[PDB]
Amino acid sequence: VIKPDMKIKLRMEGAVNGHPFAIEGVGLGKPFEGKQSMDLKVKEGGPLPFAYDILTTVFNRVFAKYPENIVDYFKQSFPEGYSWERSMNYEDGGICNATNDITLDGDCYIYEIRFDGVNFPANGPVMQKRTVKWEPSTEKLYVRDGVLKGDVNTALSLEGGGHYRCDFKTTYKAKKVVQLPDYHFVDHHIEIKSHDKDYSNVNLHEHAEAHSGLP
Amino acid sequence: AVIKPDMKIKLRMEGAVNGHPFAIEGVGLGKPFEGKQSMDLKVKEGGPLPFAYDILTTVFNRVFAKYPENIVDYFKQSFPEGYSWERSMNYEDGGICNATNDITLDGDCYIYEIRFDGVNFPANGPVMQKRTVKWEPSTEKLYVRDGVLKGDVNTALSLEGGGHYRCDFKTTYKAKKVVQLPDYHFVDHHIEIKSHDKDYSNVNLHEHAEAHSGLPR
Amino acid sequence: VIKPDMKIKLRMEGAVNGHPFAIEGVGLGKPFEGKQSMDLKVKEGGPLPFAYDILTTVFNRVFAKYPENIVDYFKQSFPEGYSWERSMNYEDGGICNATNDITLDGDCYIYEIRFDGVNFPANGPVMQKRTVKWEPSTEKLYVRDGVLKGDVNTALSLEGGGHYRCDFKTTYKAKKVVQLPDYHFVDHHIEIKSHDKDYSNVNLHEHAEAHSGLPRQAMDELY
Amino acid sequence: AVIKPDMKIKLRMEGAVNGHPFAIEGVGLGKPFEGKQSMDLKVKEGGPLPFAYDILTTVFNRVFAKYPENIVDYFKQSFPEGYSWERSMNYEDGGICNATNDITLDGDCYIYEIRFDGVNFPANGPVMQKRTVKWEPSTEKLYVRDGVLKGDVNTALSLEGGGHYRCDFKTTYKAKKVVQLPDYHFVDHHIEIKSHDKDYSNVNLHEHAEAHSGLPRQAMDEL
After folding, report:
1. Is A184 annotated as belonging to a binding site?
2. Which helix (H) or strand (E) holds D149?
3. In chain D, how many domains are there?
4. CA-to-CA distance for A163 and B113, rounded, in angstroms?
5. Which GO BP terms apply (chain A) (predicted)?
6. Is A118 close to B100, i.e. CB distance below 8 A?
7. Under a CB-based contact definition with an 8 Å cutoff, are residues A99 and B16 in contact?
8. Which residues, in sequence order, are bridge partners of residue B157?
9. In what helix (H) or strand (E) does residue D77 lie, and over which residues does it extend?
10. C215: which residues sit within 8 A by CB, 6+ positions away?
11. Which domain holds residue A19?
């Protein structure tokens, strides 16, 4: 039920340090090529008082290229879909929790996202908007208690050079019984391609490919 | 006069655990100078709650803490304007709860606007299986960092079979006006659910807290 | 087994960021009043290139005043004694692992201590010796898998004010079957009372008292 | 060039796990430019080892990593004078291991002095019950901070009955002379025990590592 070219629609409602906001996005991707892009609009809470990069890994592992020799948990879960929950622990104490419920209508994936971040220090790179980009990363995926887990430890490049680390822990839950994968990896690369001064409009790109490590 | 011997509480929580939304409203009373409060809580949406009610109860205000004259009281100084706080609660099995409270004052009644979001509680864990009994008493340590008051507490839920399930709280407190800042100190806490109905649609909750400076006694 | 006045002898061997050192100590204390004091000398690896305070909580919960209300896992364990293992995680990523095997010879406890600290940054408060003292602390003890655990989240105060946080996780192991206590707390207060310029001589004091949290009606209301 | 296509390794490790000391010595050989190495290891004291041998094996040299010309090689620039590293290893049930290695070069032989200290491994956990199978392949990220090189790796042990036991590595790498610092990059690893006797008094250990810089925008898969 996956076509070479899929559409994406999403809404995110959330809060950082107790300030609410809301973002909507339309996008396109090629699930068997592991590539997606999307345009995102802030609809409430603008101009955002925090670094936009903390949102972008939240904005669907169906858009990862899986080799034949690895079980693809995500494409197997449609038409019914799947959801995920995630905690993002930054190295200065900032914590974000996020959830995404992913459903499918026709050729369009539809995401409902909730995001809540707390304890970002006022003088930190997130609240001062001093991030540049996420570095390329490698996610580890493994089964525990009948569902799929993913961990990624990565970092944001910063305006003066330097790196601000963050650790992701994700739980993926298919809405039907699916084949379960063995331990594997997905390399990711996400960038903001364009944006306006206050990030009211963002064009965002991601590329992901599954592997098995040093062969 | 601002902070009276007896005060009222009004609150609404909205939140989600593992992506399941719910909402709760509360009405209560307390004694700010005695460090004691109680409240009755009603699930308004998302009931019956499919998780342990105990992960909510420390989210349901440090103005209700007995401060000796030895220690600057950040929280009573902050009224009438009020203060807000943010907290992350890290459970030893990977369950993470983020919460925020904005606390204002209308006459003799505190009003809380609470948001709660928990993720990654495992289906077979004591939270989703409702195997918790109560929070142990705890000691919070409060200290200033970069102009605001921080509080940390490492504590544990007692569980049904005997056993303890640990959690780390990290709270940032932000007064809404400039107040005098306290030196490093502690608050001892003790929170209990004194009654509840079977599915916890109605909960009666009590807390007791006193600040101190540690040893000597 | 446990006299009102007891003595202490210790030897610690360790490394910080891969640089080795060794310290010997003698002392005295009162296990029932929760007080002790010891004199410490650097034998090897001096002058110490790191903040001495990272060592001092490693230099025995037998020196803690327990009420009869709370089962005393530690006083129960002698003559045989007990051991403990500890990891201390500082907020900037420096980690110290320590072990202590505690035996008893006459009225003198003997400690065999090992200490290993890694990843302290060059310009942090440990390597640059900007620490002042440990704050008073509260360690929570609880049973798991038939042994006693204790966790403490505390902090060192810094030179120009401010605090440097550290989490301790300790495992206590009696060398014999003892009765295990319920969940409880030990308050602590550790202080360096005197030292010379580079801490090759240090006099250290500790006071420690067990309790069970905020009471419904506290006893401290007129005899 | 001080780095040759074939080079030998000599090492001694002394350490302890939950207070029980041991020592291992090893001899090996590896090809730094192909990123491969093998070694034979012998328990010299403290055997038979009461813990899973796997906790030791990532401690038994990033000079044996295949670096492309595209990425600065911090480790091969550091010789002959060499470099040292410190590491904490944080297992998901509370077990923690701190380790250090001081690496020098003698002729064309690498010499390691290793210190290992692990604490708080539960008695019924997979390490003390020896229920581990192997480390999964891993990816290390490397970045500069405070003018030295850091490496982090989050990985897991595979366990006998199925399932995985996670561990987080944090390493500091310090050249002994001034070298040029790399940009953010990665090393994929793969470590396996090729053979061992029943109590692991003798082990043959192999490792493969290659450096890279992440998912390419297009990549050299053009044909």
Report:
1. no
2. strand D148-159
3. 1
4. 35
5. bioluminescence; generation of precursor metabolites and energy
6. yes
7. yes
8. B135, B165
9. helix D74-77
10. none
11. 1-215
